[PDB]
Symmetry: C2
């Protein structure tokens, strides 16, 4: 029993973290097989970041301009290339600690573990959600760029995030491992608008199910509702619309608890309309939306 | 920028997790050098747990009655002994993945990372606080007993917790690695009273300092107060008394922010007396007490 925000064990990812230095800039890199992945803005100076032509800046760099260091050992760079917003540094040595891995572009509302590193050294691990507006509410200091997000299915590590930028509002933006930014963000120091930060409705429901399983039942009401009726209320409180797919995904939790999804939806409606009246659910005084139905089932076997 | 509940990287601990099986019971063990540590109630059946004489139960067990398995490989048990509530199984092989480690009995209010494992396999990692009443609010399913809590100072792993029991109230109790229970708890299936769960005042203050550093300033008031005056208010809301030691520990955070500890104490007083009026601090609608001053400084470099 009990319910906590949990990351995956970071051991397999730790062994893939290296230090990439180019000129005077240092940040993190991901060493898989004979390739190191890092944010391309490693090549930029403070001044360049305002308006960088990455192609032109990359042309002034040769292989020997990239210092790749794995722990105490220096890797030989035998080729470089830019793939969207990440730099792929080819090295002569295959990482012996390379786990079985995929690169995965994850969907908004999905969760992953972040291994926060400083200049190639892992410092800690926490669980994140890719928010509907494609930002994350993480924790990244200077020299933590290139820190990666991942999920683990048994022996396979699915890397899904690389950290690149902190926006003027203090939320975080980044790419998949193919270098494509999540959301409309670019690797430039300008004012960048993140959209309205809507709540991940299916996750909130999953968490309410977790609550019931762990003996928090107070919020359960005598009402039910409909998809449309619920969604009217959802739009007002900036909740993502609930679809039949979302309903279907909650099925096992519905099955385990004996509470139909639409009944839980009605419970949520009253919580949105009346608040919590200073009570707590699973030790939180607000509605948590950074647990997927999978995360709940994982922890509520 | 940003502030998150972060665990230490679990890589060094993962490599020390093994499966211990005795009769029909299976749980986790900690393999360090040529010694495996596990909860002694591995020797108990469901029935034994009601009222076990561990000495008598241990006498019926020989070395070959303990199946110690590290991943796919079986370890040879060449000696066993009971040290308080943990079993020390001596094996013929030194763990090659043994990191530099200490055993440390931690103080109430201090934090640590928990690597939740199932039958020797790590499943996830989250940060805990040893609560003033010597319980933890963790997440442990069946076969997660023997999961360990630890801190990491550079290369050294300080193990401080082993999980043994879930109390009828659904909070968790356990031991240090010398097998001494935190709090008055025993490894027996009876009704066990945890005391009043007081709030860790110094941690709450540290978190408020973190808030200020990250731009949450709304709660800052025009008042100050005294240790005694503050503590009067602390006792009413079941907060730990604040001592000069606690004041001293907050000094660097006081120094960084320009806010004297007693001024922050006054801010906290008003928050306790008036609540939050439905606002949030660092994305929480209540006062967080599971970050130490060290945890804050670590994340707010």
């Amino acid at each position: 029993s009990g319910f906590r925000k949990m990351a995956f064990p970071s051991g397999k990812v730790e062994g893939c973290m290296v230090q990439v230095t180019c000129g005077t800039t240092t940040l993190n890199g991901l060493w898989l097989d004979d390739v190191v992945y890092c944010p391309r803005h490693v090549i930029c100076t403070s001044e360049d970041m305002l308006n960088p032509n990455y192609e032109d800046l990359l042309i002034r760099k040769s292989n020997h301009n990239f210092l790749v260091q794995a722990g105490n050992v220096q890797l030989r760079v035998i080729g470089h290339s830019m793939q969207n917003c990440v730099l792929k540094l080819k090295v002569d040595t295959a990482n012996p600690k390379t786990p079985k891995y995929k690169f995965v572009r994850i969907q908004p509302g999905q969760t992953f573990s972040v291994l926060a590193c400083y200049n190639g050294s892992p410092s800690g691990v926490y669980q994140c959600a890719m928010r509907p507006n494609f930002t994350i509410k993480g924790s990244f200091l200077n020299g933590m760029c290139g820190s990666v997000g991942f999920n683990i299915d048994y022996d396979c590590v699915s890397f899904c995030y690389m950290h690149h930028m902190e926006l003027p509002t203090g939320v975080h933006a980044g790419t998949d491992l193919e270098g494509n930014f999540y959301g409309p963000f670019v690797d430039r120091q300008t004012a960048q608008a993140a959209g309205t930060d809507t709540t991940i409705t299916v996750n909130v429901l999953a968490w309410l199910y977790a609550a019931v399983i762990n003996g928090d039942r107070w919020f359960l009401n005598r009402f039910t509702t409909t998809l449309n009726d619920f969604n009217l209320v959802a739009m007002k409180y900036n909740y993502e619309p609930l679809t039949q797919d979302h309903v279907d995904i909650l099925g096992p939790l519905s099955a385990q608890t004996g509470i139909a999804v639409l009944d839980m939806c009605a419970s949520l409606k009253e919580l949105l309309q009346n608040g919590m009246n200073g009570r707590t659910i699973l030790g939180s005084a607000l509605l948590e939306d950074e647990f997927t139905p999978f995360d709940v089932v994982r922890q509520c076997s």
